[PDB]
Amino acid sequence: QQIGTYTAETHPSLSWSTCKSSCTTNSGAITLDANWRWVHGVNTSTNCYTGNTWNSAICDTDASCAQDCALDGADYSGTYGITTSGNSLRLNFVTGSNVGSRTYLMADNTHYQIFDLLNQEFTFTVDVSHLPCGLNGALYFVTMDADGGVSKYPNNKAGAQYGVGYCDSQCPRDLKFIAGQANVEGWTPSANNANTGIGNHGACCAELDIWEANSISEALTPHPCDTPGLSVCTTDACGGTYSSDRYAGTCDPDGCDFNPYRLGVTDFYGSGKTVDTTKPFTVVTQFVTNDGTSTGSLSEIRRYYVQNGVVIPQPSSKISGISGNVINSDYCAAEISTFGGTASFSKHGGLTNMAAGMEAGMVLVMSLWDDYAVNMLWLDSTYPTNATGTPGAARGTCATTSGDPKTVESQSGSSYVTFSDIRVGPFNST
Ligand SMILES: OC[C@H]1O[C@@H](O[C@H]2[C@H](O)[C@@H](O)[C@H](O[C@H]3[C@H](O)[C@@H](O)[C@H](O[C@H]4[C@H](O)[C@@H](O)[C@H](O[C@H]5[C@H](O)[C@@H](O)[C@H](O[C@H]6[C@H](O)[C@@H](O)[C@H](O)O[C@@H]6CO)O[C@@H]5CO)O[C@@H]4CO)O[C@@H]3CO)O[C@@H]2CO)[C@H](O)[C@@H](O)[C@@H]1O
Ligand SMILES: OC[C@H]1O[C@@H](O[C@H]2[C@H](O)[C@@H](O)[C@H](O)O[C@@H]2CO)[C@H](O)[C@@H](O)[C@@H]1O
Ligand SMILES: *[C@@H]1O[C@H](CO)[C@@H](O)[C@H](O)[C@H]1NC(C)=O
Ligand SMILES: *[C@@H]1O[C@H](CO)[C@@H](O)[C@H](O)[C@H]1NC(C)=O
Ligand SMILES: [Cl-]
Ligand SMILES: [K+]
Ligand SMILES: [K+]
Numbered sequence: 001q002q003i004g005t006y007t008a009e010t011h012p013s014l015s016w017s018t019c020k021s022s023c024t025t026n027s028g029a030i031t032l033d034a035n036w037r038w039v040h041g042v043n044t045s046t047n048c049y050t051g052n053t054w055n056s057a058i059c060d061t062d063a064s065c066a067q068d069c070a071l072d073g074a075d076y077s078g079t080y081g082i083t084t085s086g087n088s089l090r091l092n093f094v095t096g097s098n099v100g101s102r103t104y105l106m107a108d109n110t111h112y113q114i115f116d117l118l119n120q121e122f123t124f125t126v127d128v129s130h131l132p133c134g135l136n137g138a139l140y141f142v143t144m145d146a147d148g149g150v151s152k153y154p155n156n157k158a159g160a161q162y163g164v165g166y167c168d169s170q171c172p173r174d175l176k177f178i179a180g181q182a183n184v185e186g187w188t189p190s191a192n193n194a195n196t197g198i199g200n201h202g203a204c205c206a207e208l209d210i211w212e213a214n215s216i217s218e219a220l221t222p223h224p225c226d227t228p229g230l231s232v233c234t235t236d237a238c239g240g241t242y243s244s245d246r247y248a249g250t251c252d253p254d255g256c257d258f259n260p261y262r263l264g265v266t267d268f269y270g271s272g273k274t275v276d277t278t279k280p281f282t283v284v285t286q287f288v289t290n291d292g293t294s295t296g297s298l299s300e301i302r303r304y305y306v307q308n309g310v311v312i313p314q315p316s317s318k319i320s321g322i323s324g325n326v327i328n329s330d331y332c333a334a335e336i337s338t339f340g341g342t343a344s345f346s347k348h349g350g351l352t353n354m355a356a357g358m359e360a361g362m363v364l365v366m367s368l369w370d371d372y373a374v375n376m377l378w379l380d381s382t383y384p385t386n387a388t389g390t391p392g393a394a395r396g397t398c399a400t401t402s403g404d405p406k407t408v409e410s411q412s413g414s415s416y417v418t419f420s421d422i423r424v425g426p427f428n429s430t
């Protein structure tokens, strides 16, 4: 994708902190993912993409399309409901016909910030108070290229500056641009989302979902892949949520997840609970390595919370067969043994391959979305919906009829998530 000229691209400002075993406030900024943008011909206002289909006059091939179509600048607040205030980022849900957003932290105007998380602690504050059933305010990391692909893929000029280069563990085929090619060939409009479709290519890479949550439930989920960085997959071999068989590909779509409610701890997180989601709170996450160095492999993910200045531990599992309050080799083996299903976490290298994702360096993503595929039931309801009574089926209190996108967009359009005070450093430094 090319760089358009009609609207200047100005990344809203967002500060964040680096901490030492003493913190330094870094100047940062955020960009909007390329899928939300206007895509038009080079030096013309003609759309390359309108509604849920491509303009075959310009985009007669995957390559020509990327050479000949440009992404343009965004009105962050006015069109997408994205604002920043100091160290705080607010993502609105419905803004006209726009639904949510996906944003990336920048190191400069043309590069995503890269985080090296092994043997570090990462902290943020969140307000989920305005996130009802069926929404997901996510803060997580993916193994994207810092420059968004510009150095590797010649047709890609727009790069990180225009939010190009997304990949994740679901191998998304809904992306308009992947690896310097447009996703034109085989494009199939979704029958239910007027803006969206699925192309023949998907963009796979490692994903560390440190935070997927709403006011009801939260989960922490590493997802490894066969290779850490971008791998371009084709059609149904992609696996993930955009394919016939989620387990057909090279990334783990399920992950090794820790949701306190799923693990039997139903009084921990939610309205007026131990972590009271009517108010903001701080989430601290540690990435422990086998040898205690930045170059060891990932042994354990640890977690705690702070609210009203009070430290609140991650609660331990109440499910017979699954112990503790950390994610480690024993926990991941125990989860799949007890809850059952496809061993996709092991098959894609588990924590060793998660570490490879992390060692490559990862981009920070903040998003707010609803889910046409599963209505977010996997996060905050009983799932599968016919598995009531079985261990791990219940993930939160939402009804199994909840989370229908057009429903929640009509009823709860004013929903929003605010992320703030991002901090990273050595353990005990944030
Ligand atoms: O025509 C001339 C005039 O153009 C004006 O500019 C227009 C332009 O013409 C128009 O084409 C453009 O339309 C864009 C809309 O403004 C924008 O809202 C819309 O955004 C969609 C996007 O198309 C779609 O791909 C995206 O899909 C989401 C999906 O909903 C979501 O569920 C999924 O969630 C994932 C999470 O992000 C992730 O964290 C998690 O891990 O996984 C989730 C999935 O499991 O993410 C996908 C995307 O990957 O949804 C958004 C939001 O609804 O995009 C339209 C383009 O396709 O608008 C322009 C501005 O109006 C000029 O302004 C004017 O001057 C010209 O004259
Ligand atoms: O694809 C939807 C959602 O799936 C999540 O994994 C589920 C899996 O779908 C379900 O069959 C199993 O019982 O539970 C896992 C974990 O909740 C996955 O973790 C998400 O990233 C994904 O969005
Ligand atoms: C730049 O675009 C405008 C709008 O299409 C057009 O008037 C002008 O001729 C363009 N430049 C060219 C063709 O070099
Ligand atoms: C249970 O529901 C899932 C999801 O629709 C489906 O795959 C399965 O066939 C259903 N029936 C039974 C008995 O599991
Ligand atoms: Cl869980
Ligand atoms: K601002
Ligand atoms: K994802």
Ligand SMILES: [K+]
Residues within 6 Å of the ligand: 397, 398, 399
């Ligand atoms: K309910």
Ligand code: NA
Residues within 6 Å of the ligand: 341, 342
């Ligand atoms: Na299975």
